[PDB]
Amino acid sequence: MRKIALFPGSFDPMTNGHLNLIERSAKLFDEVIIGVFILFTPEEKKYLIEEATKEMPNVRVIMQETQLTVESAKSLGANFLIRGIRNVKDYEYEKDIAKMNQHLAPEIETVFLLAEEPYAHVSSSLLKEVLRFGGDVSDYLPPNIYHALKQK
Amino acid sequence: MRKIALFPGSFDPMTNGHLNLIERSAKLFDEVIIGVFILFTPEEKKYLIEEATKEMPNVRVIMQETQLTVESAKSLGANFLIRGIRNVKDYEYEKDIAKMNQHLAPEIETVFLLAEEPYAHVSSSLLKEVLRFGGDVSDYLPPNIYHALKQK
Amino acid sequence: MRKIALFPGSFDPMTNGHLNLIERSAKLFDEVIIGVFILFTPEEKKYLIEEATKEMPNVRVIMQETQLTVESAKSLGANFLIRGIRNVKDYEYEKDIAKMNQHLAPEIETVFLLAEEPYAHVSSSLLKEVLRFGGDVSDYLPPNIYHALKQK
Amino acid sequence: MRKIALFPGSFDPMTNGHLNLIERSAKLFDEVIIGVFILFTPEEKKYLIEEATKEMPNVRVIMQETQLTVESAKSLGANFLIRGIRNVKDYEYEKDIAKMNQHLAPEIETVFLLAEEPYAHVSSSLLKEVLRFGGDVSDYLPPNIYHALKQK
Amino acid sequence: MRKIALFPGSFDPMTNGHLNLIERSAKLFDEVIIGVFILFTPEEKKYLIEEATKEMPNVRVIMQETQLTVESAKSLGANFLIRGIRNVKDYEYEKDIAKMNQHLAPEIETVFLLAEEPYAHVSSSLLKEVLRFGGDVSDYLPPNIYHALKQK
Amino acid sequence: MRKIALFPGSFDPMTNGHLNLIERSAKLFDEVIIGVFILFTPEEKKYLIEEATKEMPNVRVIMQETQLTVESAKSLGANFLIRGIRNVKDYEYEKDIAKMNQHLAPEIETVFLLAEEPYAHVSSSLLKEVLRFGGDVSDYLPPNIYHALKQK
Numbered sequence: 001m002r003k004i005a006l007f008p009g010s011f012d013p014m015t016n017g018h019l020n021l022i023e024r025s026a027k028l029f030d031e032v033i034i035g036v037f038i039l040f041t042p043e044e045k046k047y048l049i050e051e052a053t054k055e056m057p058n059v060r061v062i063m064q065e066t067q068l069t070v071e072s073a074k075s076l077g078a079n080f081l082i083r084g085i086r087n088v089k090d091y092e093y094e095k096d097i098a099k100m101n102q103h104l105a106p107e108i109e110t111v112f113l114l115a116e117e118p119y120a121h122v123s124s125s126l127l128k129e130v131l132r133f134g135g136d137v138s139d140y141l142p143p144n145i146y147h148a149l150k151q152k
Numbered sequence: 153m154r155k156i157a158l159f160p161g162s163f164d165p166m167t168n169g170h171l172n173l174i175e176r177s178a179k180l181f182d183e184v185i186i187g188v189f190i191l192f193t194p195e196e197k198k199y200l201i202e203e204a205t206k207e208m209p210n211v212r213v214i215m216q217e218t219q220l221t222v223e224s225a226k227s228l229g230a231n232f233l234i235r236g237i238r239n240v241k242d243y244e245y246e247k248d249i250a251k252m253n254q255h256l257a258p259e260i261e262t263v264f265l266l267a268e269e270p271y272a273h274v275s276s277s278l279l280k281e282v283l284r285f286g287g288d289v290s291d292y293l294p295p296n297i298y299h300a301l302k303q304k
Numbered sequence: 305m306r307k308i309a310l311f312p313g314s315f316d317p318m319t320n321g322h323l324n325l326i327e328r329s330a331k332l333f334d335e336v337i338i339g340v341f342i343l344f345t346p347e348e349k350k351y352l353i354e355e356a357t358k359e360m361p362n363v364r365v366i367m368q369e370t371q372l373t374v375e376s377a378k379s380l381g382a383n384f385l386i387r388g389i390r391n392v393k394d395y396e397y398e399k400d401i402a403k404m405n406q407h408l409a410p411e412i413e414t415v416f417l418l419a420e421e422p423y424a425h426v427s428s429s430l431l432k433e434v435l436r437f438g439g440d441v442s443d444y445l446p447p448n449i450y451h452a453l454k455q456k
Numbered sequence: 457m458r459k460i461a462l463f464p465g466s467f468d469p470m471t472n473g474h475l476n477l478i479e480r481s482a483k484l485f486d487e488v489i490i491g492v493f494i495l496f497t498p499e500e501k502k503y504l505i506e507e508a509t510k511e512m513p514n515v516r517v518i519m520q521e522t523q524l525t526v527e528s529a530k531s532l533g534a535n536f537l538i539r540g541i542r543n544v545k546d547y548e549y550e551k552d553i554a555k556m557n558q559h560l561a562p563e564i565e566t567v568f569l570l571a572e573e574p575y576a577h578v579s580s581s582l583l584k585e586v587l588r589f590g591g592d593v594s595d596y597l598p599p600n601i602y603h604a605l606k607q608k
Numbered sequence: 609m610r611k612i613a614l615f616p617g618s619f620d621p622m623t624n625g626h627l628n629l630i631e632r633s634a635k636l637f638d639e640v641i642i643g644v645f646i647l648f649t650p651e652e653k654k655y656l657i658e659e660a661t662k663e664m665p666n667v668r669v670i671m672q673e674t675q676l677t678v679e680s681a682k683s684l685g686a687n688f689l690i691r692g693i694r695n696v697k698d699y700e701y702e703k704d705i706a707k708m709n710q711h712l713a714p715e716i717e718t719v720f721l722l723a724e725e726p727y728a729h730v731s732s733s734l735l736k737e738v739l740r741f742g743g744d745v746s747d748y749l750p751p752n753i754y755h756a757l758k759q760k
Numbered sequence: 761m762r763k764i765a766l767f768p769g770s771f772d773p774m775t776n777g778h779l780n781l782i783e784r785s786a787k788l789f790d791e792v793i794i795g796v797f798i799l800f801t802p803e804e805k806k807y808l809i810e811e812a813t814k815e816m817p818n819v820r821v822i823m824q825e826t827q828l829t830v831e832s833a834k835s836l837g838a839n840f841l842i843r844g845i846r847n848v849k850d851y852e853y854e855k856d857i858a859k860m861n862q863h864l865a866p867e868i869e870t871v872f873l874l875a876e877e878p879y880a881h882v883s884s885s886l887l888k889e890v891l892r893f894g895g896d897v898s899d900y901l902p903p904n905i906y907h908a909l910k911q912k
């Protein structure tokens with residue numbers, strides 16, 4: 001049957017780094033569900049992501065009212081969690097999360113992709129800090145999300 | 153030196169990880185003092201922690217009015233500080249703490265135990281986050297503390 | 305991409321760690337190729353490994369002469385490389401290898417699974433050394449391989 | 457031409473570890489500019505630092521109202537950013553910051569010095585925690601900042 | 609359990625780093641055994657190490673032929689293994705070894721001490737590379753071993 | 761003080777990674793001395809390196825009968841050692857070496873540059889592994905060093 005992955009994240013905003021994982025994931029799984037686990041306005045926080053990922057048929061976006069990531073996956077039929085690692089810090093953090101998730105839902109596998117080097121230093125928090133000071137970070141954001149980020 | 157050890161921590165709440173450390177420490181030192189160093193409240197912790205440790209004759213619990221850990225050790229006559237390391241992050245954090253403590257009190261030794269891998273991913277804050285969303289983490293808490301915790 | 309994966313290694317011997325990654329990989333990929341790159345005999349390894357993974361319809365074992373992993377993958381039709389990470393040292397080593405493979409074959413994706421904590425300390429070279437001295441590591445090897453190991 | 461370095465930091469307060477970096481980079485660069493990228497009014501944080509660095513002719517202090525570090529460097533003709541690394545956490549954090557600053561200002565080079573061992577565990581944050589509790593960290597502070605510090 | 613500890617190593621040669629751990633260990637255990645697992649001949653090494661530790665009455669030196677550390681401990685009545693950590697590399701290495709030893713002998717506890725900063729960078733191998741080139745590392749070797757070492 | 765830096769390394773072969781550090785530090789130092797510590801032939805090494813660094817005025821190539829690095833630097837007038845860090849492994853390794861060099865020659869400063877993204881996974885040895893199997897690493901070597909490597 002279909003191999004379905006949930007890609008949980010804060011995504012405020014979604015960056016080219018997230019998008020890169022989504023593009024690579026879309027080749028690995030039959031379906032990728034982007035889970036916006038809820039600073040931004042979801043109604044369009046989800047719209048931005050949908051816009052940014054429109055050229056990929058097997059990807060969709062979902063808002064999830066706060067709950068355990070695994071319970072969200074279960075109710076979606078996702079047997080796979082997909083996560084990214086950009087450095088040692090992510091690794092140790094994602095490792096604990098994935099063990100906890102394994103304890104909570106042993107049937108769900110967490111799968112890892114490493115950041116592509118162009119984006120290994122990119123995170124939304126660093127990006128927001130640079131923009132808050134006028135720095136040009138357009139090369140790290142999807143055009144539409146960059147457009148929208150300006151209005152803030 | 154006298155084989156007396158202080159095990160300082162928040163224990164908010166105490167996990168099986170802490171407990172594991174205490175059990176192993178009880179085998180090494182003549183006395184193990186658990187120092188609850190004050191959102192679960194102080195008087196509460198103590199009773200719970202005593203309740204969970206009652207089967208170890210050489211373990212006892214004290215509430216320590218906020219102060220330097222090494223001054224608290226001196227008062228109690230503890231010559232050893234017991235810490236646990238579960239990953240690189242703890243290692244670097246505990247290492248700086250131990251160096252500062254050695255500057256403040258060179259006669260006091262910091263001793264380290266590594267997490268027993270069933271609990272390497274376990275911390276009170278991760279447990280708290282998982283409980284918030286209804287996760288079952290009873291395998292990670294002493295029964296007494298789990299129940300008392302289900303009053304949320 | 306076609307869900308065809310290569311899991312490259314020397315597997316001398318294969319451990320429950322490798323087996324564990326193969327089992328989890330088998331839930332995701334249509335085809336998991338165990339690529340044994342040529343201390344037993346080639347024909348013996350293949351037999352041991354096929355025997356240890358016979359319960360999995362979508363796993364195959366293929367002996368390969370040493371060469372570029374991505375050349376092996378391309379010969380066999382694999383679009384994915386499966387790697388495991390048991391600690392920081394593996395992470396940093398695997399990341400360099402993955403980036404190099406990305407340079408050599410951009411169309412091949414390296415996918416990562418984290419060691420299941422019971423085997424996180426296990427590698428063939430720690431096992432060998434323990435075996436050299438009569439240590440009981442039967443918990444860490446497929447029973448067919450552990451038997452074979454004693455024999456010689 | 458002159459090699460000029462900006463040394464950005466919150467210096468809250470400046471410690472002997474900072475002072476050690478400043479002294480060492482004062483030998484490496486023709487000029488070093490300490491940038492207090494904003495307790496005691498920074499109107500005095502600048503004086504504290506100025507006082508502490510008096511015996512070094514090629515060192516200046518400026519308060520850059522918060523702005524992109526590289527923008528500050530550019531407007532001062534500083535083609536070098538000087539950073540310290542105490543540990544792995546520092547390394548990964550500074551590395552992301554240097555990669556972003558490279559993207560923002562490719563002509564500016566980030567240069568790193570390792571902490572000298574007596575100060576490797578020293579942070580303003582740790583010092584403040586110890587000071588809060590009465591601990592003696594006078595060895596970790598320039599005399600003038602220590603004095604100016606025991607008043608709140 | 610009996611506060612008897614084994615401190616296993618090659619001690620080729622024994623460094624002030626080693627000596628530092630032994631001194632600190634002699635304060636914690638009733639008996640510390642330096643297990644020297646076979647530059648110098650066994651008899652020389654034993655004399656060297658005995659000479660270097662003769663100031664500590666609860667320290668003893670035993671030569672041991674290479675074998676499982678935990679069975680050497682079992683033969684000698686040691687319930688504790690004492691190990692040092694000087695960096696992340698050491699931590700990950702000792703962690704795997706401690707987990708294996710725990711699997712081989714669950715009743716044996718491995719206890720860790722962090723390197724004292726002066727010696728954090730000190731290993732026998734590095735010390736030897738510096739020695740072969742004439743560099744003065746006398747500050748890093750007990751005098752008797754230093755003297756002995758500069759006679760060949 | 762005039763700023764002259766020694767860049768010690770094996771350089772078999774020199775990569776675009778090394779070249780990258782040389783270009784960057786040539787902008788920081790009055791003189792950069794490439795110290796080839798002598799499988800490759802030195803006359804070769806030197807000519808290859810000198811040719812790959814032809815159009816940098818303040819860059820000089822030298823080979824050292826091997827001796828302590830800080831001795832070779834003192835001989836040359838180099839008050840600075842320049843190193844690169846690609847990852848955590850490099851960092852811990854270079855940190856030990858730098859501390860040992862601080863101890864041997866406290867007057868000599870070790871200065872660090874972080875690898876830039878394109879080359880952070882590149883090392884001579886990983887390169888050789890790949891070359892030795894016909895992989896294309898021409899993007900990672902200076903063109904002359906690349907042609908000269910065809911023959912072997």
Ligand SMILES: Nc1ncnc2c1ncn2[C@@H]1O[C@H](COP(=O)(O)OP(=O)(O)OP(=O)(O)O)[C@@H](O)[C@H]1O
Nearest residue numbers: 009010011017018083084085115119122123124125
């Ligand atoms: N640039 C990137 N490259 C690869 N993976 C990434 C990147 N950014 C985030 N990820 C991974 O995507 C997942 C979701 O990240 P998420 O947006 O929740 O946190 P984050 O990027 O740290 O955001 P913030 O900085 O706002 O905390 C995580 O596994 C994260 O490690």
Ligand SMILES: Nc1ncnc2c1ncn2[C@@H]1O[C@H](COP(=O)(O)OP(=O)(O)OP(=O)(O)O)[C@@H](O)[C@H]1O
Nearest residue numbers: 161162163169170235236237267271274275276277
């Ligand atoms: N599961 C565990 N296994 C081994 N050691 C642990 C474990 N949890 C905590 N420790 C160690 O025991 C001591 C108690 O620490 P403390 O309870 O303050 O931290 P913590 O559990 O990380 O708390 P929090 O997550 O609430 O910040 C610390 O030295 C910590 O590293």
Ligand SMILES: Nc1ncnc2c1ncn2[C@@H]1O[C@H](COP(=O)(O)OP(=O)(O)OP(=O)(O)O)[C@@H](O)[C@H]1O
Nearest residue numbers: 313314315321322387388389419423426427428429
């Ligand atoms: N116990 C384990 N858990 C998870 N992943 C593992 C485990 N052992 C090996 N791997 C991963 O599987 C792949 C094959 O590993 P490899 O062939 O190097 O075996 P190894 O046991 O590390 O070998 P050796 O110890 O002999 O060098 C690598 O990506 C490795 O990191």
Ligand SMILES: Nc1ncnc2c1ncn2[C@@H]1O[C@H](COP(=O)(O)OP(=O)(O)OP(=O)(O)O)[C@@H](O)[C@H]1O
Nearest residue numbers: 465466467473474539540541571575578579580581
């Ligand atoms: N003891 C030290 N030795 C060497 N470098 C240091 C030391 N303390 C800080 N630095 C470096 O100096 C720069 C400025 O540090 P800064 O004061 O901004 O942060 P910090 O020291 O972490 O302060 P805080 O603890 O308040 O966050 C950073 O690059 C930091 O790594």
Ligand SMILES: Nc1ncnc2c1ncn2[C@@H]1O[C@H](COP(=O)(O)OP(=O)(O)OP(=O)(O)O)[C@@H](O)[C@H]1O
Nearest residue numbers: 617618619625626691692693723727730731732733
């Ligand atoms: N300077 C030091 N400070 C603290 N611990 C140390 C130091 N040197 C070694 N140790 C620890 O003491 C134990 C014995 O180590 P070992 O005999 O391997 O010494 P070593 O110097 O690492 O030897 P080698 O250079 O051959 O690896 C190990 O656990 C090691 O990590």
Ligand SMILES: Nc1ncnc2c1ncn2[C@@H]1O[C@H](COP(=O)(O)OP(=O)(O)OP(=O)(O)O)[C@@H](O)[C@H]1O
Nearest residue numbers: 769770771777778843844845875879882883884885
């Ligand atoms: N690609 C790179 N980017 C940045 N720094 C580098 C790079 N390659 C090497 N260096 C640094 O340059 C210095 C010289 O390194 P060295 O001669 O050991 O080359 P190496 O590539 O590590 O060799 P090998 O991998 O064959 O052992 C070291 O400090 C190393 O960390």
